[PDB]
Coordinates of C-alpha atoms and ligand atoms in Angstrom, one line a residue:
Chain A
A1 CA 55.0 -13.0 83.6
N2 CA 52.2 -12.5 80.9
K3 CA 49.4 -10.4 81.9
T4 CA 46.3 -8.6 80.6
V5 CA 47.7 -5.2 78.7
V6 CA 45.8 -2.1 79.2
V7 CA 45.4 -0.5 75.7
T8 CA 44.5 3.5 75.2
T9 CA 42.6 4.3 72.2
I10 CA 40.3 7.5 71.0
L11 CA 36.7 7.4 70.0
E12 CA 37.5 8.4 66.0
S13 CA 35.6 7.4 62.9
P14 CA 36.5 5.1 61.5
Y15 CA 39.6 4.0 63.9
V16 CA 37.7 3.2 67.1
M17 CA 33.4 3.4 66.7
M18 CA 30.9 2.7 69.3
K19 CA 28.4 0.1 68.1
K20 CA 25.0 1.4 68.4
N21 CA 23.6 -1.6 69.9
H22 CA 26.7 -0.8 72.7
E23 CA 24.8 -0.6 76.1
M24 CA 23.8 -4.3 75.3
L25 CA 27.6 -5.2 75.3
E26 CA 29.8 -6.0 77.4
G27 CA 34.4 -5.5 77.7
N28 CA 36.2 -5.0 74.2
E29 CA 33.0 -6.0 71.7
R30 CA 31.5 -2.8 72.7
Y31 CA 33.7 -1.4 70.2
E32 CA 34.1 -1.3 66.1
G33 CA 36.6 -0.3 63.5
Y34 CA 39.7 -0.3 61.6
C35 CA 42.1 -0.1 65.5
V36 CA 39.8 -2.2 66.8
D37 CA 39.8 -5.0 64.4
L38 CA 44.1 -4.6 64.6
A39 CA 44.6 -4.2 67.9
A40 CA 42.9 -7.8 67.8
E41 CA 45.9 -9.3 64.8
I42 CA 48.4 -7.0 67.4
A43 CA 47.2 -9.1 70.9
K44 CA 46.9 -12.8 68.4
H45 CA 50.9 -12.4 67.0
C46 CA 52.1 -11.2 70.1
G47 CA 50.6 -14.0 71.7
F48 CA 48.8 -11.4 74.4
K49 CA 45.2 -10.7 76.5
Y50 CA 44.0 -6.8 76.5
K51 CA 41.4 -4.7 78.0
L52 CA 40.4 -1.8 74.9
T53 CA 39.4 1.7 76.8
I54 CA 38.6 5.1 76.1
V55 CA 41.4 7.5 76.9
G56 CA 39.7 10.1 79.2
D57 CA 40.1 13.3 78.3
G58 CA 39.2 12.4 74.7
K59 CA 42.7 14.1 73.2
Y60 CA 45.2 12.9 71.4
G61 CA 48.4 14.3 72.8
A62 CA 50.3 17.1 74.0
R63 CA 52.2 18.7 76.9
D64 CA 51.7 22.0 78.9
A65 CA 54.3 24.9 78.2
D66 CA 53.6 25.4 81.5
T67 CA 53.1 23.0 83.8
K68 CA 55.5 20.3 81.0
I69 CA 52.0 17.6 82.0
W70 CA 51.2 15.4 78.5
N71 CA 48.1 14.7 78.4
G72 CA 45.6 12.7 76.5
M73 CA 47.0 8.9 75.0
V74 CA 50.2 9.8 75.2
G75 CA 50.3 11.2 78.8
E76 CA 48.3 7.4 79.3
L77 CA 51.2 5.7 78.1
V78 CA 53.8 8.4 79.7
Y79 CA 52.0 8.0 83.8
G80 CA 52.2 4.6 83.5
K81 CA 47.7 4.5 83.4
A82 CA 47.9 2.6 80.3
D83 CA 50.6 -0.5 78.6
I84 CA 50.3 0.8 74.3
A85 CA 48.4 2.7 72.0
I86 CA 46.8 1.6 69.2
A87 CA 45.1 4.6 67.5
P88 CA 45.4 7.1 64.5
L89 CA 48.4 8.8 66.4
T90 CA 51.2 11.0 64.3
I91 CA 54.7 9.7 64.3
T92 CA 56.4 13.0 66.1
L93 CA 59.6 14.2 67.2
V94 CA 57.9 15.9 71.1
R95 CA 55.9 12.7 70.5
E96 CA 58.7 9.9 69.9
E97 CA 61.6 11.5 72.5
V98 CA 58.7 10.6 75.2
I99 CA 57.0 7.4 73.5
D100 CA 58.5 4.4 72.0
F101 CA 56.1 4.0 68.1
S102 CA 56.1 1.4 65.8
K103 CA 57.4 1.6 62.3
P104 CA 54.0 2.9 60.7
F105 CA 50.9 1.2 60.5
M106 CA 49.5 3.3 58.3
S107 CA 50.1 6.6 55.8
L108 CA 48.8 10.5 55.8
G109 CA 49.0 13.7 55.1
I110 CA 47.6 17.3 56.4
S111 CA 45.0 17.7 54.2
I112 CA 42.2 20.0 53.4
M113 CA 38.1 19.8 54.1
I114 CA 35.7 21.6 52.6
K115 CA 31.6 21.9 52.1
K116 CA 31.2 21.6 48.3
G117 CA 31.3 24.5 46.0
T118 CA 34.0 26.0 48.4
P119 CA 36.2 28.4 45.8
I120 CA 39.3 27.2 47.8
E121 CA 41.9 24.3 45.6
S122 CA 44.7 25.2 48.3
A123 CA 46.0 26.0 51.0
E124 CA 48.1 28.7 49.0
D125 CA 43.7 30.0 48.5
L126 CA 43.4 29.8 52.1
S127 CA 46.4 31.4 53.0
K128 CA 45.1 34.6 50.1
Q129 CA 41.5 35.4 52.0
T130 CA 39.4 36.1 54.0
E131 CA 35.6 35.2 54.2
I132 CA 36.9 31.3 54.4
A133 CA 37.6 30.8 58.0
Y134 CA 39.9 27.6 58.6
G135 CA 41.4 25.6 61.5
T136 CA 42.0 22.5 63.4
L137 CA 42.0 20.1 66.0
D138 CA 43.0 21.0 69.1
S139 CA 46.2 18.8 71.2
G140 CA 47.2 17.2 68.0
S141 CA 49.4 17.1 65.4
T142 CA 48.2 19.3 63.3
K143 CA 47.8 22.6 64.7
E144 CA 51.8 21.7 66.0
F145 CA 52.6 21.9 62.3
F146 CA 51.7 24.8 61.4
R147 CA 52.1 26.6 65.6
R148 CA 56.1 25.5 65.1
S149 CA 56.0 25.7 60.6
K150 CA 58.5 28.9 59.4
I151 CA 57.2 27.7 55.8
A152 CA 55.6 30.8 54.6
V153 CA 52.4 30.0 53.7
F154 CA 52.1 28.0 56.6
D155 CA 53.2 30.7 58.9
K156 CA 50.7 32.8 57.8
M157 CA 47.5 30.2 58.3
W158 CA 49.2 30.2 61.4
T159 CA 49.4 33.9 62.9
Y160 CA 45.7 33.7 61.2
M161 CA 44.4 30.8 63.0
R162 CA 45.9 31.5 66.8
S163 CA 44.2 35.0 66.5
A164 CA 41.0 34.3 65.0
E165 CA 37.3 35.1 65.9
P166 CA 35.5 33.6 67.0
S167 CA 37.9 29.9 67.5
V168 CA 38.8 28.7 64.1
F169 CA 39.9 25.8 67.4
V170 CA 38.1 22.9 67.4
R171 CA 37.8 20.0 70.5
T172 CA 36.7 16.8 67.9
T173 CA 36.9 15.5 64.5
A174 CA 33.3 15.2 64.4
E175 CA 33.3 19.0 66.0
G176 CA 35.8 20.0 63.1
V177 CA 32.7 18.2 60.2
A178 CA 30.2 19.9 61.7
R179 CA 31.6 23.2 61.7
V180 CA 32.2 22.9 57.5
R181 CA 28.8 20.8 56.8
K182 CA 26.8 23.6 59.1
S183 CA 28.6 26.4 57.9
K184 CA 27.5 27.1 54.5
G185 CA 30.3 26.6 53.2
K186 CA 32.3 29.9 55.4
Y187 CA 34.4 27.2 57.3
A188 CA 37.2 24.7 55.8
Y189 CA 38.8 22.0 57.9
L190 CA 42.7 21.1 57.6
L191 CA 42.9 17.3 59.0
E192 CA 44.7 14.4 58.0
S193 CA 44.2 13.0 54.7
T194 CA 42.9 9.4 56.1
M195 CA 40.1 11.3 58.5
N196 CA 38.9 13.0 55.5
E197 CA 39.0 10.6 52.6
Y198 CA 36.5 9.1 54.8
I199 CA 34.2 11.4 55.8
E200 CA 33.6 12.1 51.9
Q201 CA 32.7 8.6 51.2
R202 CA 30.1 9.2 53.9
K203 CA 26.4 10.7 54.0
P204 CA 24.5 13.2 53.9
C205 CA 27.7 13.2 50.7
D206 CA 28.6 16.9 51.0
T207 CA 32.3 17.4 52.1
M208 CA 35.1 17.3 49.9
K209 CA 39.2 16.8 50.1
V210 CA 41.1 19.5 47.7
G211 CA 44.6 20.1 47.0
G212 CA 47.7 18.1 47.8
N213 CA 48.3 16.8 51.0
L214 CA 51.0 19.5 52.7
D215 CA 52.9 17.1 54.9
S216 CA 53.7 13.4 54.8
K217 CA 53.4 11.4 57.8
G218 CA 52.3 8.0 59.7
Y219 CA 50.8 6.7 62.8
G220 CA 52.0 4.0 64.2
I221 CA 51.5 1.5 67.7
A222 CA 53.2 3.6 70.5
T223 CA 54.0 1.5 74.1
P224 CA 55.9 4.0 77.2
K225 CA 59.6 4.5 76.0
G226 CA 61.7 1.0 77.0
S227 CA 58.4 -1.5 77.1
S228 CA 59.3 -5.6 76.5
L229 CA 56.0 -5.1 74.3
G230 CA 58.0 -2.9 71.8
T231 CA 60.3 -5.0 70.1
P232 CA 57.0 -7.3 69.2
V233 CA 54.5 -5.4 68.5
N234 CA 56.7 -3.2 65.2
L235 CA 57.2 -7.1 64.3
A236 CA 53.2 -8.1 64.2
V237 CA 52.8 -4.5 62.4
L238 CA 55.4 -5.6 59.8
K239 CA 54.4 -9.0 59.3
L240 CA 50.7 -7.6 59.2
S241 CA 51.6 -5.1 56.3
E242 CA 53.8 -7.8 54.5
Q243 CA 50.3 -10.6 55.3
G244 CA 48.8 -7.1 53.4
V245 CA 45.6 -7.6 56.6
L246 CA 46.4 -3.7 56.9
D247 CA 45.6 -3.2 53.0
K248 CA 42.5 -6.0 54.0
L249 CA 41.4 -3.8 56.6
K250 CA 41.8 -0.2 55.3
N251 CA 39.7 -1.9 52.4
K252 CA 37.3 -2.9 55.2
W253 CA 36.6 0.3 56.9
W254 CA 37.1 3.3 54.0
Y255 CA 35.9 1.3 50.7
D256 CA 33.4 -1.0 51.8
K257 CA 32.1 2.1 54.0
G258 CA 31.4 4.0 51.3
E259 CA 27.6 5.3 51.4
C260 CA 28.3 7.8 48.4
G261 CA 28.6 6.0 45.3
Chain B
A1 CA 85.0 8.4 71.7
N2 CA 83.5 10.2 67.8
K3 CA 85.1 9.0 65.1
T4 CA 84.7 9.0 61.5
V5 CA 81.4 7.6 60.3
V6 CA 81.4 4.1 57.8
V7 CA 78.3 5.4 55.2
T8 CA 77.2 2.6 53.4
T9 CA 75.3 3.4 49.8
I10 CA 74.7 2.3 45.7
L11 CA 74.3 3.9 43.2
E12 CA 70.8 4.5 41.8
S13 CA 68.9 7.2 40.7
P14 CA 68.8 9.9 41.8
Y15 CA 70.3 9.3 45.8
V16 CA 73.1 8.9 44.7
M17 CA 74.7 9.4 41.1
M18 CA 78.1 9.6 40.2
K19 CA 79.0 13.5 39.1
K20 CA 79.9 13.5 35.2
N21 CA 83.7 15.1 35.9
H22 CA 83.6 12.0 39.0
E23 CA 87.5 11.1 38.0
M24 CA 88.2 14.4 38.4
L25 CA 87.0 14.4 42.7
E26 CA 87.9 13.0 45.9
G27 CA 86.1 12.0 48.9
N28 CA 82.5 12.3 49.1
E29 CA 82.7 15.2 46.8
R30 CA 82.2 12.7 43.6
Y31 CA 78.5 11.7 44.3
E32 CA 75.2 14.0 44.4
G33 CA 71.8 13.4 44.7
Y34 CA 69.0 12.9 46.9
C35 CA 70.6 10.6 49.7
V36 CA 73.3 13.1 49.9
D37 CA 72.1 15.8 50.3
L38 CA 70.5 13.6 53.2
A39 CA 74.1 12.0 54.7
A40 CA 74.9 15.6 55.3
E41 CA 72.2 17.0 56.9
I42 CA 71.9 14.1 59.3
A43 CA 75.6 14.2 59.6
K44 CA 75.1 17.6 60.5
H45 CA 72.6 17.0 63.3
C46 CA 74.1 14.3 64.5
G47 CA 77.5 15.6 65.3
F48 CA 79.7 13.5 63.8
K49 CA 81.8 13.2 60.4
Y50 CA 81.1 10.2 57.7
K51 CA 83.0 8.8 54.2
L52 CA 80.4 7.7 51.5
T53 CA 81.1 4.4 50.1
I54 CA 79.7 2.6 47.6
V55 CA 78.6 -1.1 48.0
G56 CA 80.5 -3.2 46.5
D57 CA 78.7 -6.1 45.3
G58 CA 75.9 -3.6 44.3
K59 CA 73.3 -5.7 45.7
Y60 CA 70.3 -3.7 48.4
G61 CA 70.2 -7.0 50.7
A62 CA 68.9 -10.8 50.3
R63 CA 70.2 -13.6 53.2
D64 CA 71.3 -16.7 50.5
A65 CA 68.5 -19.7 51.7
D66 CA 71.3 -22.3 51.3
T67 CA 74.2 -20.7 53.4
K68 CA 71.8 -18.0 56.0
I69 CA 74.8 -15.0 54.4
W70 CA 73.7 -11.4 53.6
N71 CA 74.0 -9.7 50.8
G72 CA 73.9 -6.1 49.6
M73 CA 74.1 -2.6 51.6
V74 CA 72.8 -5.7 54.1
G75 CA 75.7 -7.8 54.6
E76 CA 77.9 -4.9 54.5
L77 CA 76.2 -3.5 58.6
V78 CA 75.8 -7.1 58.8
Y79 CA 78.9 -8.2 59.3
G80 CA 80.8 -4.9 60.2
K81 CA 82.7 -3.0 57.3
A82 CA 80.2 -0.5 57.7
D83 CA 78.3 2.1 59.9
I84 CA 75.1 3.3 58.3
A85 CA 73.4 2.7 55.1
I86 CA 72.3 5.7 54.0
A87 CA 70.2 4.9 50.5
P88 CA 66.1 3.6 48.9
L89 CA 66.6 1.6 51.4
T90 CA 63.0 -1.1 52.4
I91 CA 62.0 -1.7 55.6
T92 CA 61.2 -5.2 55.3
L93 CA 60.1 -7.5 58.4
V94 CA 63.4 -9.9 57.9
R95 CA 65.7 -7.2 57.5
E96 CA 64.2 -5.8 60.7
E97 CA 65.4 -8.7 63.2
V98 CA 69.5 -8.4 62.1
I99 CA 69.5 -4.1 61.6
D100 CA 67.9 -1.4 63.4
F101 CA 66.0 1.5 60.6
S102 CA 65.2 4.6 61.0
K103 CA 61.9 5.6 60.7
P104 CA 60.8 6.0 57.1
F105 CA 61.7 9.1 55.2
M106 CA 60.1 8.0 52.2
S107 CA 56.7 6.4 51.0
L108 CA 56.8 4.5 48.4
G109 CA 54.8 1.3 46.5
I110 CA 55.7 -1.0 44.1
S111 CA 55.0 -0.3 41.2
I112 CA 54.6 -0.9 37.3
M113 CA 56.2 0.6 34.0
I114 CA 55.8 0.3 30.4
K115 CA 57.4 1.4 27.1
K116 CA 54.3 4.7 26.0
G117 CA 51.5 2.4 23.8
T118 CA 51.9 -0.5 26.2
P119 CA 48.4 -2.1 25.8
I120 CA 48.7 -2.4 30.3
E121 CA 47.0 0.0 33.6
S122 CA 47.3 -2.8 36.1
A123 CA 49.2 -6.2 37.7
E124 CA 45.8 -7.5 36.8
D125 CA 46.2 -6.7 32.8
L126 CA 50.2 -8.3 33.8
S127 CA 48.7 -11.5 35.1
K128 CA 45.7 -12.0 32.3
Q129 CA 48.1 -12.2 29.5
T130 CA 51.3 -13.8 28.2
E131 CA 52.5 -11.5 24.8
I132 CA 54.3 -8.7 27.5
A133 CA 57.4 -9.6 29.4
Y134 CA 57.7 -8.7 33.1
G135 CA 60.2 -9.2 36.0
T136 CA 61.4 -7.7 39.5
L137 CA 65.3 -6.2 40.1
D138 CA 67.4 -8.8 42.1
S139 CA 68.3 -9.3 45.5
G140 CA 65.6 -6.7 46.6
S141 CA 62.2 -6.1 48.8
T142 CA 60.4 -6.2 45.0
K143 CA 61.2 -9.7 44.5
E144 CA 60.8 -11.2 47.3
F145 CA 56.8 -9.1 47.8
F146 CA 56.2 -11.2 44.8
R147 CA 57.8 -14.8 46.2
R148 CA 56.8 -14.7 49.2
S149 CA 53.0 -13.4 48.7
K150 CA 50.3 -15.2 49.2
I151 CA 47.3 -13.2 46.7
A152 CA 45.9 -15.0 43.8
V153 CA 47.2 -11.8 41.3
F154 CA 51.4 -11.9 42.9
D155 CA 50.8 -15.4 43.9
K156 CA 50.9 -16.0 39.8
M157 CA 52.3 -13.3 38.5
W158 CA 54.7 -15.1 40.9
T159 CA 54.8 -18.4 39.2
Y160 CA 54.8 -17.0 36.0
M161 CA 58.1 -14.5 37.1
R162 CA 60.6 -17.7 38.7
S163 CA 60.2 -19.8 35.2
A164 CA 60.3 -17.4 32.0
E165 CA 62.1 -18.1 29.5
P166 CA 64.6 -15.8 28.7
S167 CA 64.7 -14.8 32.5
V168 CA 62.7 -12.0 33.6
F169 CA 64.9 -10.7 36.5
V170 CA 67.9 -8.1 36.7
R171 CA 70.5 -7.1 38.2
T172 CA 70.4 -3.7 38.3
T173 CA 67.7 -1.1 38.1
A174 CA 69.4 0.8 34.6
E175 CA 69.4 -2.3 32.8
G176 CA 65.6 -3.4 34.1
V177 CA 63.9 0.1 32.0
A178 CA 67.4 -0.1 28.9
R179 CA 65.2 -3.5 28.9
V180 CA 62.0 -1.8 29.0
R181 CA 63.0 1.2 26.4
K182 CA 64.3 -1.4 24.0
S183 CA 62.2 -4.3 24.3
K184 CA 59.1 -2.1 21.9
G185 CA 56.4 -3.1 24.4
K186 CA 57.3 -6.9 25.3
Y187 CA 58.5 -6.2 28.6
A188 CA 57.6 -4.4 31.8
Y189 CA 59.2 -3.6 34.9
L190 CA 58.3 -3.8 39.0
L191 CA 60.2 -1.3 40.6
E192 CA 59.0 1.3 43.3
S193 CA 56.7 3.6 42.3
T194 CA 59.5 6.4 43.6
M195 CA 62.0 4.7 41.1
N196 CA 58.9 5.4 38.8
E197 CA 58.3 8.8 38.6
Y198 CA 62.0 9.5 39.1
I199 CA 62.6 8.0 35.1
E200 CA 59.4 8.8 33.9
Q201 CA 60.6 12.7 34.1
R202 CA 63.5 11.9 32.2
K203 CA 64.9 11.8 28.9
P204 CA 63.8 10.3 26.6
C205 CA 60.5 10.3 28.5
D206 CA 59.5 7.4 26.7
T207 CA 58.1 5.4 29.8
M208 CA 55.3 5.6 31.8
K209 CA 53.5 4.5 35.6
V210 CA 50.8 2.9 34.9
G211 CA 48.3 1.9 38.4
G212 CA 47.6 1.7 41.9
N213 CA 51.2 0.7 43.8
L214 CA 49.9 -2.6 44.6
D215 CA 51.7 -1.8 47.9
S216 CA 52.5 0.6 51.1
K217 CA 55.7 1.2 51.9
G218 CA 58.8 2.7 53.1
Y219 CA 62.7 4.2 53.2
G220 CA 64.8 3.8 56.2
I221 CA 68.5 5.0 57.8
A222 CA 69.6 1.1 59.0
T223 CA 72.2 1.0 61.6
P224 CA 73.7 -2.4 62.8
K225 CA 71.4 -3.5 65.2
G226 CA 72.4 -1.7 68.9
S227 CA 74.5 1.2 67.2
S228 CA 74.8 3.8 69.1
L229 CA 73.6 6.4 66.4
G230 CA 70.5 4.9 66.0
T231 CA 68.8 7.1 68.4
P232 CA 69.8 10.6 66.8
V233 CA 69.8 8.9 63.2
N234 CA 66.0 8.4 64.2
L235 CA 65.5 11.4 65.4
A236 CA 67.8 13.8 63.1
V237 CA 65.4 11.9 60.5
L238 CA 62.2 12.9 62.3
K239 CA 63.9 16.6 63.1
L240 CA 64.3 17.0 59.2
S241 CA 61.0 15.6 58.6
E242 CA 59.5 18.4 60.9
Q243 CA 62.0 21.3 59.5
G244 CA 60.2 20.5 55.9
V245 CA 63.8 19.7 54.3
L246 CA 62.9 15.8 52.8
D247 CA 60.0 18.0 50.8
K248 CA 62.4 20.9 49.7
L249 CA 65.2 17.9 48.8
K250 CA 62.5 15.6 46.9
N251 CA 61.0 18.6 44.9
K252 CA 65.7 19.4 43.9
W253 CA 66.2 15.6 42.9
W254 CA 62.8 14.9 41.2
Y255 CA 60.4 18.1 40.1
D256 CA 63.8 20.0 39.8
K257 CA 65.3 17.7 37.6
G258 CA 62.0 16.6 34.9
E259 CA 63.0 17.0 31.2
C260 CA 59.9 16.3 30.4
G261 CA 57.7 19.2 30.5
Ligands
O25_301 C1 55.0 -2.1 57.5 C2 54.1 -1.1 56.8 N1 54.0 -0.4 56.3 C3 54.0 0.9 55.9 C4 55.1 2.0 55.6 C5 54.6 3.4 55.6 N2 55.7 3.6 55.4 C6 55.8 5.8 54.4 C7 55.4 6.5 55.9 O1 54.5 5.7 56.6 N3 55.7 7.6 55.4 C8 56.8 8.5 56.8 S1 55.7 8.0 57.8 C9 57.0 9.2 58.9 C10 57.6 10.2 58.0 C11 57.0 9.8 56.2 C12 58.0 9.9 55.4 N4 58.5 10.7 55.3 O2 57.7 9.2 54.0 C13 58.3 10.9 58.4 C14 58.2 11.7 60.0 C15 57.8 10.2 60.5 C16 57.1 9.3 60.2 N5 56.7 3.1 55.7 C17 56.4 2.5 55.6 C18 56.8 1.2 56.6 F1 56.4 0.5 57.8 F2 57.4 0.2 56.1 F3 58.4 2.1 56.2
LIG302 N1 46.2 12.0 64.6 C1 46.6 13.2 65.1 C2 45.4 13.7 65.9 C3 44.8 14.6 64.6 C4 44.8 15.9 63.9 O1 45.7 16.6 64.8 O2 44.6 16.6 62.6 C5 47.3 13.4 66.1 O3 47.9 12.0 66.5 O4 47.6 13.8 67.0
LIG303 N1 64.6 -0.9 47.7 C1 64.6 -1.8 47.5 C2 65.6 -1.9 45.7 C3 64.7 -1.6 44.9 C4 62.9 -3.2 44.0 O1 63.2 -3.7 45.3 O2 63.0 -2.5 43.9 C5 65.3 -2.7 48.4 O3 65.2 -2.1 49.0 O4 64.7 -4.4 48.6

């Protein structure tokens, strides 16, 4: 019998953002963004009621090599704290084994963010020099991509990054963006193209995406392995895609939100 | 107990192509291309033996509105003639209901092919004029996209296309490409970006992709609903993606095959 779905998500612009007057608001009304709108459309199309909740540790999901314990939104699904994750959650082999993922609702690749005027055009450029530091988010698919890569240029990037001092790794996207902005061109941030493209068009308009994408992948809606929600959630994603709704929401939250001309 | 997998596919460059000396060859050796190489890697990674076979009717898959019968590669899976489809087979809602699809191994969008010098930059351009004819492949996801679209510009394109005389629809990609080349700029062909991008770089180098993509989707490996092959095939796709193998094969069959500079 039908009950209220607990949705795990993460504060990540423009996907889930606190409204500025959130202290004045209750429940799902506290939040706005692409994944908030998507949650509403999916809920509507699968006939369910839901509660948005921000993941407590503020992480996406990785497994600890010692304890084998999952953190982040992945751990919330794995250990039964949440029924579904609606977020910019990257589809990976390691995750697909422990949770179910819908077909992708958005595509992306790993990309490079620089302070405007930084003399770097590509990951090759980054790997061949030392003056400009570079790093990635902690507990995410981007860090794992570099850690497990056996491709020469990325292997070389990873060997640098893992022992660089001070740490090149950051805990949130906001913190990586802040570091690019405040490091006067001496730090480049490796992040997903979708996030990069949003920030590029936000004030103070001082960052830039450079070079091709390093890989090719997608975000999926994630459910615990074998949940009854998996099948209808997947069909809702395909239907919304085909109805043009996913493209409408991308325009709403990227193009319409552009503050840089 | 483990037996030889029947793989359904379609002749579509650069995915599956007859080797020029195919009369001299037997079995899987008759064929080359991206999907031939992918079939070999997936077979290797799931521990199975396989037989490549070209779909008899030469179609992708649509359901007849009268009889409700599926044709093409989709029908081969649905009616049990094949065990798996390894091809440029687009993930759609209607198909996902009757077959299982792996996560996407390649991304694409609907795009516009013109003879070089054709005064058309976009689907809006196409929809606002009459001198230049335009159409799509029969029995495919592109025709259905336009047929079912309620988006103004594509609705308008579809109303034209469905009653245009002579027919704007073609039976194979080769035939749509031939029509662009031989119609002196008076026909534009609507096809998937991946196919477009390949042809653009092939002699006689007289076509061109123009405008943004009309939509966003992917190709998946397809199995009959509930096949034991679904789960290991999906994990092989993610692993190959992550190992960089899918990117290596894209370069092999697109960039390395470029004859246009
Ligand atoms: C129904 C919404 N359609 C969006 C969509 C976008 N794609 C393609 C895509 O997002 N690309 C992905 S995602 C991804 C991979 C790849 C790839 N190699 O191209 C490899 C590893 C696993 C995750 N496909 C679709 C859709 F949903 F039709 F299938
Ligand atoms: N979307 C990523 C987080 C961002 C990143 O790693 O760059 C994940 O699911 O882990
Ligand atoms: N890949 C398409 C065929 C090509 C097209 O429709 O443009 C399909 O699966 O139907």
